[PDB]
Design a protein around this ligand. Sequence first.
Ligand SMILES: *[C@@H]1O[C@H](CO)[C@@H](O)[C@H](O)[C@H]1NC(C)=O
Lengths: 49, 49
Amino acid sequence: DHFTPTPVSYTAGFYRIPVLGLTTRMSIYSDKSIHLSFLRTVPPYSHQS
Amino acid sequence: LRNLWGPEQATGLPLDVNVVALLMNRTDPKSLITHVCDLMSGARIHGLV
Ligand SMILES: *[C@@H]1O[C@H](CO)[C@@H](O)[C@H](O)[C@H]1NC(C)=O
């Protein structure tokens, strides 16, 4: 029940490399300061709003 | 870091208080995650500085 691509992106993120996480559409992945180089191709649930 | 623990810490209410002073001069992420998995498994260290 993790559903987290965050350890992969953060392991490749000490070199600050963009990692495409394509698991879910959570809004916690939409932050700029928590996720600096984590650029995905999926939109969050605010687009449903 | 070794001298800060010996003569100080007079009001020590826990009992499992032990300091570990290490120096990782080079910070590649493979060795960093290796040190994290070695220190967290190393008798349950609850402090990461
Ligand atoms: C890290 O560098 C210090 C000198 O700044 C040295 O004394 C120490 O032995 C080094 N750590 C290692 C490789 O154990």
